[PDB]
Design a protein around this ligand. Structure first.
Ligand SMILES: NC(=O)c1ccc[n+]([C@@H]2O[C@H](COP(=O)([O-])OP(=O)(O)OC[C@H]3O[C@@H](n4cnc5c(N)ncnc54)[C@H](OP(=O)(O)O)[C@@H]3O)[C@@H](O)[C@H]2O)c1
Ligand SMILES: NC(=O)c1ccc[n+]([C@@H]2O[C@H](COP(=O)([O-])OP(=O)(O)OC[C@H]3O[C@@H](n4cnc5c(N)ncnc54)[C@H](OP(=O)(O)O)[C@@H]3O)[C@@H](O)[C@H]2O)c1
Lengths: 233, 230
């Protein structure tokens, strides 16, 4: 009607959970989507305790089923979407020769199909609305192939190339909507890693700035805003 | 009895690839939706070499359960070579793209190719002489305007196949995986389907993971993996 919402898939844990909290601290109304309804309701209670005025819509749904992706987007037609974050995803690490192919089907339906459908529907309806942003969560593994993660990385090469191509297509069309891609990287005693909260801070930095790519170097773990990486014709 | 399995064999590169492997003396399993087109191709092949075994399998590979049922059928045959060539392309701006087409593209260019590849690797990785050849595109290494989603499916195919090829090498596996990346008429360079099939045979015959046509020069080059690798 008049309120604007920030939509986050995969909001029940990890980066999406902390991303919801980061946008709530910026005073944004939220629609938070995942399978674990009880975890989303917990997140909603935390957010509203911090700021009572915010609107927070819980949507429990399995986005690995194609029909649920379209029906989710239809349920959202009554809300003015300012920002869509495609963060729902998962990863399976294995040699290809003995990988669980049902998990592969899950990585494809969620990491690729759900993200591209929601991205494309959002672009269809909001391309011309000022202030809109599409933020797709890829991975550092969407720009570097990582041993024992061949199929997962391929899904993120899809996310990164799709999002870079879309961002450049929107710019060429002088569209109001912007598209951006976040590419996070990663016993804990000896190895560098970022927390989910730190990763959400990188998401916010990507949102606030006008670079298409926000990427963590897998070697140095420095986070850098940068221009598209892939070759473009 | 060993067989060369080609998906997308009813026209274009896949059709010419079947003819090229038949000239090499290979038995074939040829797969696509149009049964009558496959049956024609069989009769042309047997007109040239009557002693070859050619198996026609009409099936829609954009349906997940069909991909698995097909591979179950293929267990009755010793597969020497699997060529994942079934695919298609849709050129559009994203904002008004037919999402039905997008779904089918995802199911065919990505899902069918990765499932058949992974099943083939599971059974054949230690079998001498075996090759997996996946058909990507020069657009799987360069993003091309008005082909954003299509290119992204081909970035998947290229990165998946490069990653798998290096994984097989590291594991000292007998199986090899390779990727082919092909690229009014009178003013613009192009390759025929027949020429593209000759590039596929070159890739098959040689010791390189990538066979790619340069988008600018249209020169075909055998080369090592292109993407960054950890
Ligand atoms: N360098 C890297 O490779 C890297 C590192 C970190 C994160 N990432 C990416 O960042 C994103 C967040 O992942 P994460 O690290 O934060 O792990 P995570 O804690 O498991 O978060 C992933 C989110 O996906 C949700 N989700 C999973 N399956 C779903 C389904 N079918 N339908 C709807 N929601 C679903 C999960 O919630 P439910 O279980 O409740 O559904 C969860 O909230 C992913 O896209 C991941 O690939 C990449
Ligand atoms: N520069 C480039 O980017 C470039 C250029 C050429 C080719 N390619 C790639 O090379 C491959 C061959 O394409 P092409 O040029 O030869 O065009 P094509 O003539 O359309 O060949 C595509 C093949 O896929 C088959 N097929 C399509 N949908 C199918 C489905 N659901 N189930 C089973 N089989 C299906 C088609 O046969 P049916 O209709 O009978 O099913 C046909 O045999 C594709 O993967 C294409 O992306 C890329």
């Amino acid at each position: 009607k008049e309120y604007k919402y920030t939509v986050i898939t995969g909001a029940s844990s990890g980066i999406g959970y902390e991303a919801a909290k980061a946008f709530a601290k910026r005073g944004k109304n939220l629609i938070i989507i995942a399978r674990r309804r009880e975890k989303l309701e917990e997140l909603k209670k935390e957010i509203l305790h911090y700021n009572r005025s915010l609107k927070v819509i819980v949507k429990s749904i399995d986005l690995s089923i194609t029909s649920n992706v379209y029906s989710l987007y239809d349920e959202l037609k009554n809300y003015n979407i300012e920002t869509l974050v495609n963060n729902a995803g998962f990863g399976d690490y294995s040699k290809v020769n003995n990988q669980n192919l049902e998990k592969v089907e899950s990585m494809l339906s969620l990491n690729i199909e759900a993200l591209v459908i929601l991205s494309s529907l959002f672009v269809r309806d909001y391309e011309k609305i000022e202030g809109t942003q599409l933020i797709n969560i890829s991975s550092a593994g969407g720009y570097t192939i990582v041993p024992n993660a061949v199929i997962y990385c391929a899904t993120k090469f899809f996310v990164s190339s799709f999002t870079e191509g879309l961002a450049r297509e929107l710019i060429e069309a002088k569209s109001n909507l912007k598209a951006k891609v976040l590419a996070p990287a990663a016993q804990e005693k000896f190895h560098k890693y970022h927390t989910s909260k730190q990763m959400a801070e990188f998401l916010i930095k990507l949102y606030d700035n006008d670079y298409i790519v926000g990427k963590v170097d897998r070697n140095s773990f420095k986070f850098t805003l940068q221009n598209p990486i892939f070759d473009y014709a």
